[PDB]
């Protein structure tokens, strides 16, 4: 039989993957530190990639790409986009962004002065990776409050042009963001899960007051605790593609595929092709796959912007079964075979 | 991308390419002490064995 | 001209030494009886090949080599083999019984009894050198003799030849190739004791050589002979510059100057291409661009690791055969736009290139096809620390239970030497991390 | 790389004689000591076990010991009996009466210096003695009591040499007297302190294999000894023949024994057949790890392997051997300790044993061996609790306290094994 080890106990996704693997009767879970495994479901931090692929007679596979963190941290994502010629500073689907240390403190003020002098909208957002779990975010129109805020936190932050003109769902006049799940297998095929989730705001979008931040930040934890109207429009502030597509037809006479999904597929492909030579495990002595969470914003012109890339995403409750089954089919059984497709392959 | 310090002989050549620029020991006596100290520990352990066997 | 003395310790060192000197003789036109018809200076000379060979009055070319092992059966093969006439008996040194895979037995118990004899025989070779530059030392990490006696000898070489350089060729243990259970212990113990005494060390992982023999030579179960003839090709390409006319890596000092800017981080990664099966009836000869590109494939490295996730401190390319500088630069240009090659900040991004026009020599009847051009890349990359991590983990698993420790204490080693050596390795892995990785 | 072989008492000499018959046939040595083989591979390591005599005869480096003459007259009359050096038969007349005290303290002590005189003479003609192998039973008096006395005196004279024993453990299923557990418990304590490696050969296992697997309705000692001699040949293959493993008894001890007292091995052999059928490498590897092929009646599923050595003999695919060996581990990885990496070692030799195209020999250092010492311990205590049969030992000058101490020593051994069976 095939053998695997589980080293991330907090992963909702691979808890379910491991549950499915055992139920096939053809996989056995070994102890955390048994080196004789075929499959490692690895820890989030300090995954020991250097100990993979040295066990004689075992084809070994791990559920993380070494080096994919470059895409999945807020600071290094900005750096990767600016310095990669495939993406370039002239990248049209990623907001103007700068990395600030308590370095790009100077150039950020250069563009800030330019916009404010031109009387343009000058609202920015400051965020970081260390600012996890729904806090440590500042939306302001004054650069003073943004730089003063980062020095007090004391960690590497990004300042980004805040999308002042989002697409607003009706009724409710409300903000949202789109989560897409993407699976990259050991052959570096890029699979987009058919089902995405809109994570909605429950409160009407207020362009005057950025201090409240319940109608500005769409995270499921900020809407579950600080928001009135939570749940009235959609269960759990989650709209799925069928309803959203139907909305775009009724409201804006277009479809999710045409107005949004072509851009999303374009962005996913651009990001993952850019880092392919750095992280591909083709010809390597062990193989990798990884599940990614891409977060997108849509403006009122139906232009799609990339906000961030999550390297250890969770799944929406109603989508856990389908996607986890798809992970076993496409990423695990393709390497370790047992005795219609829910993914769009991005070529 | 520049080539520098090209040397040529009838057997071959050598040169350098620069793509981008940048930005106490133990004495003889001390070794002898260590080796003798280990031997003494070996002798001590063997004497304990032979003492044990004499009992 | 400045001489180099080669020292081969234990089974692995001796058997690899035999494969190297055999290949050296083929490369220099020296027959097994030591005669060299092309050397027109009879009885002497200061040619480049004289760095490795002395000369007798009868025109006999004798390796500047000492072979040391604590049991006699492997060196007895040298004494009766094809090249038995090459060496004086004074150069082949055997003890009565071996170190039983036990570092402490090779280092303390048996080593204390044979070390002065070995130094006497090396002194005899040194006394024939007008300007000895230092020593090339071949040994396994895993054997009791290769680990334990080598570290004792290196310490004494530092005392007796203080100003002389010392390079290592070290065989790193792999379960696919006849390993013993205690080899992680012996590897850590000998690396700790030898570290301060070695200026440059080329690690060869038996796992990587094994898999190259399986994949590229189509040998299902490689023997030591298959393994060692491949290793001796890599060794030959590293030492070619000491034995032939040239201007790169012309003395041992230059190895550290070109590959080792930080003294403790002195383990260059070797990568070699192409390795082609001699039984391959149809073969298309590979271009400069293709063999150079192959130098950045993990599958061709002497130690399996991923240089994309480390940083380079230095990089040397050593070509043999039909290669001209223009092809090399055109190939480097292409690779830099395709591969992840990142140097540390305080080092220039570049390559020292050496070309020798003579293509690799292949042993008649061997497994390796003759090729028109080959390259060995020596790169000091922090990625080689993956091998130290793998070894330290295995050490930690056994040492937590003190499994087998009594065998070492019973030879007079103190238990504290284990954790002292483990602590040194921990600092070593930390040094690679500070040099090679950026904060996440 | 010389080994000096010693065989003591009835069991020790009958199993020892079979061992020399088997390996003499493997090395091409006829019963008169003349070599008549066909491969020089037979002669490359002949000196490990044989001295070369004047007329190019080969003589076992073997010393034959007993306190009564009967079994050694049988050996001398036996098939290869003339091969042994006549001066190496050392024997008394009184016997030891299945009594460890007679062997260790009274009758044996009168004879032991004569044995050491012969041991000294054989060692003197060794270029570089590896060490000693002893064959004996633990349930009688001579092999058990005089055998362990011998081991103690050899250690005093050769403290840096390896001592290796093949020790037959008693079983009520194949029993001569009720005092066997006393004799075995007294001996185990000696072995814990004074051997480096001991092959535990359980007469209960031998009987079960003859009965259940070989379909012998009425096993005899001779049937039992066939299994022993095949196993002894198997575990000494790498000493006796060339191969890529360049290892002797000390290298075996270094890599098999992670803690000095835990040096009691479970041997096994495959095939065992009740035959002309081809055995495949998968079958050979499956059987060699099967409890039913083990010679110590212990269930390996009841413990964990600290270390394993596997030796394959015959012309077979080494690639297939590795695959099956990796398969066996990767399947049953809950029976190997995870804190000794690469603790299963595979070795190969081209020469198959007599009458087989291929075979495999298993050497396990498993914590399950503790079941063997528990069984002896229980049988000991059931008698010792009532001081039953003790007068046979106190009449030779022994005290009850020495029994209490041997019992505690074996219970400690059992607890040491149990401490590593849960070690994680
Ligand atoms: N590549 C290669 N590795 C070898 C060779 N011989 C042994 N090894 C490796 O070296 C290690 C074993 O050590 P040896 O060199 O044989 O031991 P030794 O130095 O002779 O020491 P003792 O025999 O213990 O006294 C194992 O990892 C072997 O795989 C060889 O010829 N080639
Ligand atoms: N540049 C921008 N312009 C407008 N709104 C933005 C923005 N960047 C972020 N937001 C809003 O802030 C929310 C939180 O931003 P961010 O993506 O940094 O949080 P996060 O890292 O917690 C996402 P996840 O929970 O998936 O990891 C987003 O969901 C979005 O609604
Ligand atoms: N396997 C085997 N066991 C034997 C043989 N002879 C005796 N035994 C066992 O050995 C023990 C008796 O010891 P024995 O050697 O006869 O007494 P000794 O002559 O005083 O050493 C009992 O456990 C017997 O079952 C034999 O030839 N083969
Ligand atoms: C003299 O014969 C042997 C000597 C050494 C070994 C041996 C055993 C086990 C090992 O790991 C548990 C090992 O690493 C090396 C050698 C060995 O096992 C193969 C031998 O044959 C049984
Ligand atoms: Ca000359
Ligand atoms: Ca020095
Ligand atoms: Ca008497
Ligand atoms: Mg995030
Ligand atoms: Mg050796
Ligand atoms: Mg009897």
DSSP string for residues in C61-76: EEE-EEEEESSSHHHH
Burial class (CB in 10 A: 0-12, 13-18, 19+), D302: middle
CB C394 within 8 A of CB C91: no
- Report the alpha-carbon distance of residue A113 to residue C363 in Å, rounded: 72
- Report the alpha-carbon distance of residue D407 to residue D412 in Å, rounded: 9
Map tokens 């089919």 to a residue.
Answer: A329
3-state secondary structure of B49: helix
- Report the alpha-carbon distance of residue A133 to residue A225 in Å, rounded: 12
- Listed in order, strand segments (DSSP E) in C43-132 are 53-55, 61-63, 65-69, 92-94
Q: What is the resolution of this structure in A?
A: 2.1
The one catalytic residue among C254, C284, C411, C429: C254
- List, in sequence order, the alpha helices (H) in D80-220: 100-104, 107-124, 147-157, 180-194, 203-208
Element (H, E) at A235: none
CB-based contact D156 B46, cutoff 8 Å:
no
CATH 2.30.29.30 holds for D369-424: no
Residue A51: its chain C contacts at CB < 8 A?
Answer: 389-390, 393
C254 is catalytic: yes
Residue D346: its chain A contacts at CB < 8 A?
Answer: none
Class of domain D1-258: alpha beta
CATH numbers and ranges of domains, chain A: 1-63 (3.40.50.11480), 64-95+165-347 (3.30.470.20), 96-164 (3.30.1490.20)
For residue D247, how many other CB atoms are within 10 A of its CB?
21
Element (H, E) at C343: none
What one-character DSSP code corresponds to residue A317?
Answer: G
Whether the link from the prior residue into D418 is cis, omega within 30° of 0, is no
**Residue ranges of D for the binding site for GTP?**
10, 68, 137, 141-143, 203, 225
CB-based contact B22 C351, cutoff 8 Å:
no
Structure tokens, D186: 């007294």
A140 touches ligand 2 (CB under 6 Å)? no
* Ligand with an atom nearest the CA of residue C13: 1
* Ligand with an atom nearest the CA of residue A134: 2
Q: Percent helix, strand and coil across chain B, each rounded to 5?
A: 50, 30, 20
Chain A interface, Cβ < 8 Å to D: 1, 3, 30-31, 33-36, 56-58
Regarding chains B and A, contact by 3 or more CB pairs under 8 A is answered as no
Structure tokens, C128: 């024939």
Structure tokens, D125: 């003609």
Map tokens 């070529």 to a residue.
Answer: A347
- Report the alpha-carbon distance of residue A307 to residue D61 in Å, rounded: 82
Element (H, E) at D353: none
D340 touches ligand 4 (CB under 6 Å)? no
Please state the separation of Cα D349 from the chain's center in Å: 21
- Report the alpha-carbon distance of residue C257 to residue C267 in Å, rounded: 13
CATH numbers and ranges of domains, chain C: 1-268 (3.40.50.1440), 269-383 (3.30.1330.20), 384-440 (1.10.287.600)
- Report the alpha-carbon distance of residue A227 to residue D196 in Å, rounded: 74
Structure tokens, D386: 């009532």
CB D364 within 8 A of CB C197: no
Chain B interface, Cβ < 8 Å to D: 46, 49-50, 53
Residue from D55, D89, D53, D71 nearest D15 by CA: D71
User: Where do you find CATH 1.10.287.600 in chain D?
Assistant: 369-424
Best mutation target, D320, D326, D333, to test chain A (most A CBs within 10 A): D333
- Ligand 3 atom with minimal separation from the D97 CA: 20
3-state secondary structure of C92: strand
- Report the alpha-carbon distance of residue C175 to residue D341 in Å, rounded: 9
Contacts made by residues C292-295, CB under 8 angstroms, sequence distance 24+: C292/C317, C292/C328, C292/C331, C292/C332, C292/C335, C292/C375, C293/C331, C293/C334, C293/C335, C294/C375, C295/C271, C295/C375, C295/C377
Class of domain D259-368: alpha beta
CA distances from D57 to D32, D46, D52 (A): 8, 11, 6
- Write phi, then psi, for C433 (nearest 5 degrees): -65, -45
Element (H, E) at D335: none
Structure tokens, D17: 């004689």
- Report the alpha-carbon distance of residue C318 to residue C269 in Å, rounded: 13
- Report the alpha-carbon distance of residue B38 to residue D107 in Å, rounded: 42
Q: What strands, in cross-sheet order, belong to the sheet with A157-161?
A: A97-100, A157-161, A124-127, A138-140
- Report the alpha-carbon distance of residue D264 to residue D251 in Å, rounded: 16
CA distances from D211 to C415, D205, D217, D362, D377 (A): 50, 10, 6, 21, 26
- Report the alpha-carbon distance of residue C48 to residue C4 in Å, rounded: 11
CA distances from D190 to B45, C109, C140, D141 (A): 19, 27, 38, 14
Map tokens 């080792």 to a residue.
Answer: C260
Angle of helix D180-194 relative to helix D147-157, nearest 10 degrees, comes to: 10
Please state the separation of Cα C61 from the chain's center in Å: 23
User: Where do you find CATH 3.40.50.1440 in chain D?
Assistant: 1-258
Please state the separation of Cα A347 from the chain's center in Å: 20
CB A113 within 8 A of CB A152: no
- List, in sequence order, the alpha helices (H) in C195-223: 206-215
Residue from D19, D195, D7, D34 nearest D118 by CA: D7
Burial class (CB in 10 A: 0-12, 13-18, 19+), D54: exposed
D390 touches ligand 4 (CB under 6 Å)? no
Burial class (CB in 10 A: 0-12, 13-18, 19+), A333: middle
Question: Which among A1, A31, A36 has CB closest to D329?
Answer: A36
Determine the distance separating the centroid of ligand 5 and the alpha carbon of C53, expressed in angstroms: 9
D239 touches ligand 4 (CB under 6 Å)? yes
3-state secondary structure of A173: coil
CA distances from C3 to C118, C132, C164, C324, D143 (A): 19, 5, 11, 29, 63
A138 touches ligand 2 (CB under 6 Å)? no
Q: Which amino acid residue places its CA nearest to atom 4 of ligand 4?
A: D252
Q: Is C71 annotated as a binding residue?
A: yes
Q: Which amino acid residue places its CA nearest to atom 23 of ligand 3?
A: D170
C180 touches ligand 4 (CB under 6 Å)? yes
What one-character DSSP code corresponds to residue A280?
Answer: -
Map tokens 């007079």 to a residue.
Answer: C412
- Report the alpha-carbon distance of residue C336 to residue C153 in Å, rounded: 42
Structure tokens, C378: 């020596």
- Listed in order, strand segments (DSSP E) in C149-266 are 165-172, 200-205
- Report the alpha-carbon distance of residue D287 to residue D295 in Å, rounded: 13
């Amino acid at each position: 039989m095939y053998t695997f080890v589980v080293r991330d106990e907090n992963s909702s996704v691979y808890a379910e993957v491991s549950r499915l693997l055992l139920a096939t009767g053809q996989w056995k879970r070994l102890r955390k530190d048994n080196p004789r495994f075929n499959l490692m479901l690895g820890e989030r931090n300090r995954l020991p990639f250097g100990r993979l692929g040295h066990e004689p007679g075992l084809v070994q596979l791990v559920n993380y790409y070494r080096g994919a963190d470059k895409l999945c941290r807020k600071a290094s994502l900005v750096k990767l986009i600016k310095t990669s010629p495939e993406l370039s500073e002239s990248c049209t689907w990623f907001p103007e962004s700068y990395v600030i240390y308590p370095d790009e403190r100077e150039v950020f003020l250069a563009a800030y002065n330019r916009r404010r002098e031109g009387r343009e909208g000058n609202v920015w957002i400051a965020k970081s990776s260390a600012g996890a779990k729904g806090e440590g975010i500042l939306i302001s129109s004054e650069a003073s409050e943004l730089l003063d805020f980062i020095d007090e936190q004391g960690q590497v932050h990004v300042i980004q042009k805040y999308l002042e003109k989002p697409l607003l769902l009706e009724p409710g006049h409300r903000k949202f963001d789109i989560r897409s799940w993407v699976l990259v297998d050991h052959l570096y095929n890029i699979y987009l899960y058919r089902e995405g989730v809109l994570r909605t705001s429950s409160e009407p979008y207020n362009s005057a007051n950025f201090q409240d931040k319940t109608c500005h930040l769409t995270n499921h934890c900020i809407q579950k605790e600080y928001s009135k109207n939570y749940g009235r429009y959609e269960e759990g502030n989650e709209m799925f593609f069928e309803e959203f597509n139907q909305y775009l037809m009724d409201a804006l006479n277009t479809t999710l595929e045409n107005s949004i999904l072509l851009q999303i597929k374009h962005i996913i492909r651009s990001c993952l092709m850019c880092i392919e030579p750095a992280i591909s495990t083709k010809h390597l002595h062990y193989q990798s796959f990884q599940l990614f969470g891409f977060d997108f914003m849509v403006d009122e012109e139906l232009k799609v912007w990339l906000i961030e890339v999550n390297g250890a995403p969770a799944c929406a409750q109603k989508l856990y079964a389908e996607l986890c089954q798809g992970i076993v089919d496409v990423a695990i059984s393709s390497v370790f075979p047992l005795a219609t497709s829910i993914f769009i392959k991005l070529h | 991308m520049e080539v520098i310090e090209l040397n040529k002989c009838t057997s071959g050549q050598s040169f350098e390419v620069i793509l981008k620029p940048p930005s106490r020991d133990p004495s003889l006596e001390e070794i002898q002490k260590k080796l003798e100290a280990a031997e003494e520990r070996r002798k001590y352990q063997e004497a304990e064995l032979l003492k044990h066997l004499a009992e | 001209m400045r001489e180099c003395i080669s020292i081969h310790v234990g089974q692995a060192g001796v058997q690899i030494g035999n494969a190297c000197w055999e290949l050296y003789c083929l490369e220099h036109g020296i027959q097994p009886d030591g005669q060299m018809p092309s050397d027109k200076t009879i009885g002497g000379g200061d040619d480049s090949f004289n760095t490795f060979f002395s000369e007798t009055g009868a025109g006999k070319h004798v390796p500047r080599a000492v072979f040391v092992d604590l049991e006699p059966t492997v060196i007895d093969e040298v004494r009766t083999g094809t090249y038995r006439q090459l060496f004086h008996p004074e150069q082949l040194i055997t003890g009565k019984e071996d170190a039983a895979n036990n570092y402490a037995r090779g280092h303390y118990t048996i080593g204390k009894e044979i070390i002065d004899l070995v130094l006497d025989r090396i002194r005899k070779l040194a006394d024939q050198c007008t300007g000895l530059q230092g020593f090339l030392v071949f040994h396994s990490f895993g054997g009791g003799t290769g680990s334990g006696f080598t570290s004792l000898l290196m310490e004494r070489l530092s005392v007796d030849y203080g100003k002389k350089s010392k390079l290592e060729f070290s065989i790193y243990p792999a379960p696919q190739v006849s390993t013993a259970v205690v080899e992680p212990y012996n590897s850590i113990l000998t690396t700790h004791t030898t570290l301060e005494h070695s200026d440059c060390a080329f690690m060869v992982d038996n796992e990587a050589i094994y898999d190259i023999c399986r994949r590229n030579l189509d040998i299902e179960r490689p023997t030591y002979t298959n393994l060692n003839r491949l290793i001796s090709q890599i060794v030959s390409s590293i030492t070619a510059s000491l034995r032939f006319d040239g201007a790169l890596n012309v003395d041992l000092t230059e190895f550290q100057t070109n590959l080792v800017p930080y003294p403790r981080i002195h383990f260059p990664l070797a990568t070699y291409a192409p390795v082609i099966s001699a039984e391959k009836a149809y073969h298309e000869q590979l271009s400069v661009a293709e063999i150079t590109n192959a130098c950045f494939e993990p599958a061709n490295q002497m130690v399996k690791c991923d240089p994309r996730h480390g940083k380079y401190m230095a990089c040397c390319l050593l070509y043999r055969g039909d290669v001209v500088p223009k092809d090399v630069n055109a190939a480097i240009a292409t690779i830099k736009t395709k591969r992840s090659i990142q140097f540390v900040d305080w080092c220039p991004t570049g390559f020292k290139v050496g070309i020798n026009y003579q293509p690799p020599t292949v042993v008649p009847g061997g497994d390796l096809a003759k090729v028109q051009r080959a390259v060995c890349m020596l790169s000091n990359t922090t990625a080689i620390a993956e091998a130290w991590a793998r070894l330290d983990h295995k050490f930690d698993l056994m040492y937590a239970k003190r499994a087998f420790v009594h065998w070492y204490v019973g030879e007079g080693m103190e238990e504290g030497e284990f954790s002292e050596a483990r602590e040194d390795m921990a600092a070593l892995e930390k040094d690679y991390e500070e040099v090679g990785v950026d904060s996440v | 790389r010389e080994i000096v072989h010693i065989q003591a008492g009835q069991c020790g000499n009958q199993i020892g004689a079979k061992f020399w018959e088997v390996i003499s046939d493997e090395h091409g040595i006829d019963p008169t000591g003349s070599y008549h083989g066909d491969s020089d591979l037979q002669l490359e390591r002949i000196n490990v076990y044989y001295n070369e005599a004047t007329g190019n005869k080969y003589v076992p480096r073997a010393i034959l010991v007993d306190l009564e003459p009967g079994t050694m007259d049988s050996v001398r009359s036996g098939p290869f009996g003339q091969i042994f050096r006549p001066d190496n038969f050392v024997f008394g007349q009184s016997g030891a009466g299945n009594n460890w005290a007679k062997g260790h303290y009274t009758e044996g002590a009168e004879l032991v210096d004569s044995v050491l005189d012969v041991v000294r003479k054989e060692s003197e003609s060794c270029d570089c003695l590896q060490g000693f192998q002893l064959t004996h039973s633990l349930g009688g008096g001579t092999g058990s009591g005089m055998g362990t006395l011998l081991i103690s005196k050899i250690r005093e004279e050769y403290p840096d040499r390896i001592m290796n024993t093949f020790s037959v453990m008693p079983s009520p299923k194949v029993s001569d007297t009720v005092v066997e557990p006393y004799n075995a418990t007294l001996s185990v304590h000696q072995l814990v302190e004074n051997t480096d490696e001991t092959y535990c050969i359980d007469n209960e296992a031998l009987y079960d294999i003859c009965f259940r697997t070989l379909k012998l309705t009425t096993p005899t000692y001779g049937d039992l000894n066939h299994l022993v001699s095949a196993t002894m040949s198997g575990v000494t293959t790498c000493l006796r023949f060339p191969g890529q493993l360049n290892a002797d008894l000390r290298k075996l001890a270094v890599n098999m024994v992670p803690f000095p007292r835990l040096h009691f091995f479970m041997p096994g052999f495959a095939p065992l057949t009740s035959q002309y059928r081809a055995l495949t490498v998968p079958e050979l590897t499956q059987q060699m790890f099967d409890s039913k092929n083990m010679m110590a009646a212990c269930d390996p599923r009841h413990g964990r392997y600290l270390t394993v050595a596997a030796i394959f003999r015959g012309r077979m695919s080494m690639k297939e051997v590795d695959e099956q060996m990796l398969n066996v581990q990767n399947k049953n990885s809950s029976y190997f300790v995870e804190w000794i990496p690469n603790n299963v070692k595979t070795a190969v030799c081209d020469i198959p044993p007599r009458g087989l195209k291929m075979s495999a020999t298993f050497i396990g250092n498993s914590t399950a061996i503790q079941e063997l010492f528990k069984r002896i311990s229980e049988q000991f205590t059931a008698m010792f609790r009532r001081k039953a049969f003790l007068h046979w030992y106190t009449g030779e000058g022994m005290d009850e306290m020495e029994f209490t101490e041997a019992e505690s020593n074996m219970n400690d051994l059992v607890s040491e094994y149990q401490q590593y069976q849960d070690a994680t």
